[PDB]
Design an enzyme around this catalytic site. Structure first.
Site, short mmCIF file in Angstrom:
data_model
loop_
_atom_site.label_atom_id
_atom_site.label_comp_id
_atom_site.label_asym_id
_atom_site.label_seq_id
_atom_site.Cartn_x
_atom_site.Cartn_y
_atom_site.Cartn_z
N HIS D 43 0.80 -1.10 -0.09
CA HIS D 43 -0.02 -0.05 0.07
C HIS D 43 1.06 1.42 0.11
O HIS D 43 0.28 2.21 -0.27
CB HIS D 43 -0.77 0.21 1.25
CG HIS D 43 0.00 0.27 2.44
ND1 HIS D 43 0.61 -0.59 3.24
CD2 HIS D 43 0.11 1.67 2.84
CE1 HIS D 43 1.14 -0.02 4.22
NE2 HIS D 43 0.90 1.58 4.08
N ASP D 99 -0.55 -7.40 2.00
CA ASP D 99 0.13 -6.33 1.97
C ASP D 99 1.70 -6.43 1.71
O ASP D 99 2.53 -6.33 2.65
CB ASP D 99 -0.04 -5.34 3.24
CG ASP D 99 0.19 -4.01 2.79
OD1 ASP D 99 0.50 -3.53 1.74
OD2 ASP D 99 0.33 -3.14 3.97
N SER D 205 6.01 2.10 7.02
CA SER D 205 5.51 1.00 6.46
C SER D 205 6.38 0.48 5.39
O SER D 205 7.24 1.10 4.87
CB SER D 205 4.24 1.41 5.37
OG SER D 205 3.29 1.43 6.18
#
Lengths: 36, 10, 12, 259
Positions: D43, D99, D205
């Site tokens: 993402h 993810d 992330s």
């Protein structure tokens, strides 16, 4: 997966490679016996 | 619905 | 977002 | 990273920065798994709810970095992408399942005292190290706090941050959220009764959640900083992309013993 081999990852040049520890590492190693 | 449930990507 | 130089070669 | 500390120089040589060209904005972290392959959370690249869709030539990869903003002219290495891979069953809509993304480097990187790849777990290492109780280590240049007072300070760090935090049991993770937890996630952090804090936060992330094996003295990337509800909330844990269940895919696409 039954996978190790070839190519030395994970052994960090300023640290493992020089037999030095970083400052918070032992907290990790200890959490395997559970302490500190 | 992730967003709805108040979820958030990092 | 306080960023420095980087050779423009990479920003084109 | 919330409630972490400055990393020492060289302490996570596999930490990679995902840098957007225009405008120049730090977009996520990532990890070096090889001189040409870098693993990130998908993402970072593909989040339709925020109209976020990157193509190989939007971004750059900066490897070797200590400072968040400085141009570390002699230490870091700045790379272009050849191909981006996102996991075909990546569910951004509902629960953020799978993810994961790989990105292949247009040219391979030279390894130094500041650049070196992490290991990917095998079955026994996954088996023996992913246990509730055991601490992992998260690093990244993301937000220091969930929200802060605007313009009174700096909400993102000057240097790479480190936080160590323990892995929570599935049931506890599962009853911390109302979002659909999948066996390709784990959650990690401290319990409210634990009296210690830390989390990852936005921009962290893709950064690696790693463990060190006491027996071979090496580091293994067990997870990928993925999602969470806010940051550093009590009775709330951070969720990571369980790399070991996604390793056969990473096999399929590195395709090492080929052309």
């Amino acid at each position: 997966t039954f996978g190790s081999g070839e190519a030395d990852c994970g052994l960090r040049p300023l640290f493992e490679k020089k037999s030095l520890e970083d400052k918070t590492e032992r907290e990790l190693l200890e959490s395997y016996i559970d302490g500190r | 619905d992730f967003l709805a449930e108040g979820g958030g990507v990092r | 977002g306080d960023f420095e130089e980087i050779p423009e070669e990479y920003l084109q | 990273i919330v409630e972490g500390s400055d990393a020492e120089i060289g302490m996570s040589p596999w930490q990679v920065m995902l840098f957007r060209k225009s405008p120049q904005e730090l977009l996520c972290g990532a990890s070096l798994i090889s001189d040409r392959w870098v693993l990130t959370a998908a993402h970072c690249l593909l989040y339709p709810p925020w109209d976020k869709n990157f193509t190989e030539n939007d971004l750059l990869v900066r490897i070797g970095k200590h400072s968040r903003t400085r141009y570390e002219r002699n230490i870091e290495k700045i790379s272009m992408l050849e191909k981006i891979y996102i996991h075909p069953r990546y569910n951004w809509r509902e629960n953020l399942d799978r993810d994961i993304a790989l990105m292949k480097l247009k040219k391979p990187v030279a390894f130094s005292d500041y650049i070196h790849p992490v290991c990917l777990p095998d079955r026994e290492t996954a088996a023996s190290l992913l246990q509730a109780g055991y601490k992992g280590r998260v690093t990244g240049w993301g937000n220091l706090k969930e929200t802060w007072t605007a313009n009174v300070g700096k909400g993102q760090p000057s240097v790479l941050q480190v936080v160590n935090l323990p892995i929570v049991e599935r049931p506890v993770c599962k009853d911390s959220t109302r979002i659909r937890i999948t066996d390709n996630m784990f959650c990690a952090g401290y319990k409210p009764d634990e009296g210690k804090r830390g989390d990852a936060c936005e921009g962290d992330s893709g950064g690696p959640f790693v463990m060190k094996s006491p027996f071979n003295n090496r580091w293994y990337q067990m997870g990928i900083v993925s999602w969470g509800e806010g940051c550093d909330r009590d009775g709330k844990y951070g969720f990571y992309t369980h790399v070991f269940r996604l390793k056969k895919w990473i096999q399929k696409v590195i395709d090492q013993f080929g052309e």
